[PDB]
Structure 1
Amino acid sequence: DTSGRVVRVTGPVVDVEFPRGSIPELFNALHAEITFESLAKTLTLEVAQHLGDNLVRTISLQPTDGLVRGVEVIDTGRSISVPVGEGVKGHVFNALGDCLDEPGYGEKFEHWSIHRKPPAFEELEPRTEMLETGLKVVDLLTPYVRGGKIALFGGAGVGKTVLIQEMINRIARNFGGTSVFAGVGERTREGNDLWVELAEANVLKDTALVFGQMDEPPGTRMRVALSALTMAEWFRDEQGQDVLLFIDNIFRFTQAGSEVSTLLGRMPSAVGYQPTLADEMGELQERITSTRGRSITSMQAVYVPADDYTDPAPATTFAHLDATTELSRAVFSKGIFPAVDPLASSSTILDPSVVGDEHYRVAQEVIRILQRYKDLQDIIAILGIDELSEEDKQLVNRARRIERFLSQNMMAAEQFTGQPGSTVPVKETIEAFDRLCKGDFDHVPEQAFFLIGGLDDLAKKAESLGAKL
């Protein structure tokens, strides 16, 4: 009596006609049925345009193989809603809120629409604040912003998953917070891998996984980030909790938006992305913010097409990123965990106006020493350390000691070594690296700096090696 019916099916794009006074609002969730027993399913459609004459153009979220013209379409009356609450922790969901490991779980939770507005201008924080994670290299050279966005540039085999579990542990144990993982365009193999690693390290109970996979139409890959962000917004606003949101390849969110724009017949912009690229990126990144004492800090994996940082997608993404963490393989091969490249990583709040003067001075001193060491590394490698000067030899030893003390015994390694993870206060890190740069540890052997906490751990590891002071 008040339901619609399919009129056109063109791949993922489905046009539905409704009665004269029952046109669904934009972004509504519609339900159609594919009854062909082999491909029998319930299609979820999202209203994208009002075409006129009671026709609406919707983007399908499942493949439309087997849909018939004239099939009844039910209007739900609301946008795509995901289950929210403490019970979404430890489970895997998709972009629509269906539990993947336990089908049917979460259906009787509170459900929140994935299309929400960022906090009002009255409620935004006018003062930036540093997020103290407890890691030496991060707290010193790449200070994270609380309620900000951190780019992650780690490939395969540099401990990106290990750093992810580490950040989950730190946000859950140092802030009493939560983690939400949005796999935007997640490889199903790597999705299952991450699931079983988070279940093995016993950090899954502190995480909610939302997977919009690669074998899915562009709609779910475009909306999975909003689903996970809605779960995170419930954890922040309603539970009163600090949240850490890991968006894996935000570039796949941009690319899915571009594909959805192409399917809807919209004329492409420059390069080829959607005409509304910056508006969508803003609509997503502006909800990740600090509000009323609580915050959502986001770590996002970024892909740069053709290594072109001026490409519209990374150029639009970097307008919102507050820090950058580059995981290096030359640092992972040295046995330095986390394998954060101290010279390729960077932060925007590494400023005397934010971190202070002593923090900034120690950080710049460490960076200068490390850059000089990297300059000398080629002469050391090709021609030998023996040819160097004596001031250069001193600097090389001091820089090796600093570069090794940047490593830390992570809380994500406790399952493999049993040693509890360290949480070095930022003051202690500043003091330790000041004393390193001065030279107070130029006699201690190198192996006494690998994977330790603050200064007392250093002194004890040294004394256990027959070296004091």
Structure 2
Amino acid sequence: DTSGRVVRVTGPVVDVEFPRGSIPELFNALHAEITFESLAKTLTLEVAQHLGDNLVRTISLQPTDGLVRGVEVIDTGRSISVPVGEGVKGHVFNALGDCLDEPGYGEKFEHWSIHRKPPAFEELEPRTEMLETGLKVVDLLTPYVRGGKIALFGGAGVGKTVLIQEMINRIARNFGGTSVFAGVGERTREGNDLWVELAEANVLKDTALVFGQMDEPPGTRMRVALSALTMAEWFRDEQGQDVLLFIDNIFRFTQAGSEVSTLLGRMPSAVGYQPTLADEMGELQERITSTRGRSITSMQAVYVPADDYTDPAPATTFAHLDATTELSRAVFSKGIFPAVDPLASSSTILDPSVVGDEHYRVAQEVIRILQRYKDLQDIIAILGIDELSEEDKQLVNRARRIERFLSQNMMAAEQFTGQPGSTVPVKETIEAFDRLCKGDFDHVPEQAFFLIGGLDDLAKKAESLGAKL
């Protein structure tokens, strides 16, 4: 009757012919069954182009191996819809909304289309607001933006998963919010590891995981971020909850878009990215924002091709990023957690008109001292601390103290140690680092600064080693 039939199969690209008055809308999801017993499945096809003569060109989300010309294609009448609600917490999904750890779960939930518009112009916030996380280094040197975007530049063995757990904890406890993780181009080994680590830290109940993996066609890797963002938008708008979205290698979203553009026969652009690189990046990043009092904040891992920051993909991604947190192995080796590089990380709202005058002055003094210590570190390494000047040695001591006080006892560490995590206010952090820059703690041993909170914890840790204010 009103169902279509497959006409062409060229890899992941499938052309489908419908009756004259039954052509599906663009982005609609169509279903076609592969009946070969070894490869029997149900392909979902997203309408990509209207070719004319009742033909539509669609991108398949599953491998099309075993698909026959002429088979029935059913139009669902809607785009890809994911389950939304509180029930998605603690469960793993793919870009199609299928539960991975429990198949068939969430089929009776409300379903939301993943293609949505950003908030209207009159609903946007004209005022930038800082997100008070509770970590000293973040709140001081690279303050986050509420409803903003934070690039994350940490690899393996620098505590990136610990930082993700920490932010999940802090959004769930200090804001009453929820977390959505998007694994875009996720490795299945690392996805299983993330699942197990979140279940063992008891933060999975606060997080909804959406995995579009590497062994999948480009359409799923291109739509997984929209699926996770749709869940986050339901949590923000319908539940009234601050959300934290985690995008795995946002670059892989760009790369899957480029691959889909190549498969659809579109002429490439500069370097090669799809001609609509900026448009797709904007359509995604504009839905992450504050509206009606609630917000979605996003920590996104960014891959930079060839370390070239002028490459079109990082250049288009950085047009939407508000802060940068680079996790360093040199900081991780010194035992400082989180291993945030204070000199390499940054924020666009570390500005006297956003954070204030004293915040800015204290942060800039800290950065100056740390940069001078970085300059002296090589003279110390090759020659020795004994060769330095007197003011040089004094600054070295003060800078080691500031380095170690930038560390913190994180809430992701309560699973191992057993002692809770700190939430230091901005005022206390500003005052503590002002005093540290003056020199009020140059007699305290270094170890008294490792993994503590504010100034009370500093005093009680100092007097445990035999040192007063």
TM-score range, shorter chain: over 0.9
Q: Secondary structure at the match of 2:44?
A: strand
Residue by residue, what CA displacement relative to the aligned partner does 1:221-253 show, whole Å, maximum 9, x if unpaired? Answer: 000000000000000000000000000100000
Measured in 2, the distance between the counterparts of 1:467 and 1:182 equals 47
Identity %: 100
Distance 2:327 2:132 in 1: 19
1:296-354 CA deviation, whole Å, 9 max, x = no partner?
Answer: 00000000000000000000000000000000000000000000000000000000010
- 1:391-414 CA distance string (max 9 Å, x none): 000000000000000000000000
SS at match of 1:313: helix
Kindly report which structure 2 residues correspond to 1:45-124, keeping only aligned pairs within 5 A, or say none. Answer: 45-124=45-124
2: CA distance, partners of 1:457 / 1:4: 69
CA distance in 1, matches of 2:120, 2:353: 26
Give the CA deviation at 1:288.
Answer: 0.2
- Unaligned ranges ≥5, structure 1: none
Counterpart CA distance in 2 for 1:52 and 1:114 is 26
Offset at residue 360 of structure 1 (A): 0.1
SS at match of 1:417: coil
Q: Distance in 1 between matches of 2:96 and 2:42?
A: 12
d(CA) in 2 for partners of 1:161 and 1:246? 11
Shift of 1:442: 0.4
CA distance in 2, matches of 1:383, 1:352: 39
Instruction: For 1:177 and 1:51, locate their aligned partners in 2 and report how far apart those are by CA, in whole Å.
Output: 45
Q: Residue 275 of structure 1: CA displacement?
A: 0.3
User: Are residue 229 (structure 1) and residue 229 (structure 2) matched?
Assistant: yes
1:194 offset after TM fit, Å? 0.1
Query: In structure 1, what is the Cα distance between the partners aligned to 2:95 and 2:8?
Result: 25
Distance 1:25 1:248 in 2: 30
- Distance across 1 between alignment mates of 2:409 and 2:266: 51
The Cα of 1:71 is off from its aligned counterpart by 0.3
Check if 1:28 corresponds to 2:28: yes
CA displacement at 1:107 relative to structure 2:
0.2
SS at match of 1:76: strand
> CA offset at residue 150 of structure 1?
0.1
Q: SS where residue 122 of structure 1 aligns?
A: helix
Structure 2 distance, partners of 1:122, 1:284, is 19
Structure 2: how far apart are the matches of 1:116 and 1:12?
A: 25
What 5-or-longer segments of structure 2 have no aligned partner? none
Distance 1:419 1:366 in 2: 28
- Residue 30 of structure 1 aligns to a residue whose secondary structure is strand
Provide the C-alpha distance between the structure 2 equivalents of 1:202 and 1:429, rounded to a whole number of angstroms: 29
Are 1:279 and 2:245 an aligned pair?
A: no
Question: How far, CA to CA, are the matches of 2:153 and 2:146 in structure 1?
Answer: 20
- 1-structure distance, mates of 2:51, 2:425: 58
Deviation of the 1:192 alpha carbon: 0.1
Aligned to 1:319, the other structure's residue is in SS state coil
Distance in 1 separating the partners of 2:305 and 2:54: 41
Post-superposition Cα deviations, 1:270-298, rounded to whole Å, max 9, x if no partner, equal 00000000000000000000000000000
Q: CA deviation at 1:369?
A: 0.1
Offset at residue 452 of structure 1 (A): 0.1
Give 2:370's aligned residue. Answer: 370
Structure-2 separation of matches of 1:225 and 1:198: 20
> How far apart are 1:196 and its partner, in Å?
0.1
Aligned residues: 469
d(CA) in 1 for partners of 2:257, 2:121: 27
What secondary structure sits across from 1:6 in the alignment?
strand
State the 4+ residue runs in structure 1 displaced beyond 2 angstroms: none
Aligned mates of 2:183, 2:264 — CA distance in 1: 24
Cα distance in 2, alignment partners of residues 370 and 419 from structure 1:
29
Post-superposition CA distance 1:117-161 (Å, at most 9, x none):
000000000000000000000000000000000000001100000
TM-superposed CA distance for 1:262, in Å, is: 0.1
List per-residue Cα deviations over 1:165-205 (Å, max 9, x = no partner): 00000000000000000000000000000000000000000
- 3-state SS of 2:378 partner: helix
2-structure distance, mates of 1:248, 1:16:
33
* Counterpart Cα distance in 2 of 1:186 and 1:282: 22
What secondary structure does 2:79 align onto? Answer: coil
Indicate the residue corresponding to 1:294 in structure 2. Answer: 294
Cα distance in 2 between the residues matched to 1:348 and 1:463:
38
How far, CA to CA, are the matches of 1:248 and 1:150 in structure 2? 12
Partner of residue 325, structure 1: 325
Deviation at 1:34, TM superposition (A): 0.1
Could you list the per-position Cα deviations for residues 395-434 of structure 1 after superposition, in whole angstroms to 9, with x for gaps in the alignment?
A: 0000000000000000000001001000000000000000
CA offset at residue 256 of structure 1?
0.1
Q: CA deviation at 1:81?
A: 0.1
Cα distance in 1 for partners of 2:461, 2:419 equals: 13
Q: CA RMSD for the aligned pairs?
A: 0.2
Corresponding residue number in structure 2 for 1:145: 145
Within 5 Å, give how 1:236-247 maps onto structure 2.
Answer: 236-247=236-247
Instruction: Provide the C-alpha distance between the structure 1 equivalents of 2:420 and 2:231, rounded to a whole number of angstroms.
Output: 30
Q: Tell me, what secondary structure is at the counterpart of 1:228? A: helix
Cα distance in 2 between the residues matched to 1:267 and 1:108: 42
TM-score (norm 1): 1.00
- Cα distance in 2 for residues equivalent to 1:57 and 1:248: 29
CA distance in 2, matches of 1:386, 1:93: 58
Q: How far did 1:112 drift?
A: 0.0
C-alpha displacement at 1:31, in angstroms?
Answer: 0.1
| d(CA) in 2 for partners of 1:463, 1:312 | 54
Shift of 1:455: 0.1
CA distance in 2, matches of 1:249, 1:294: 25
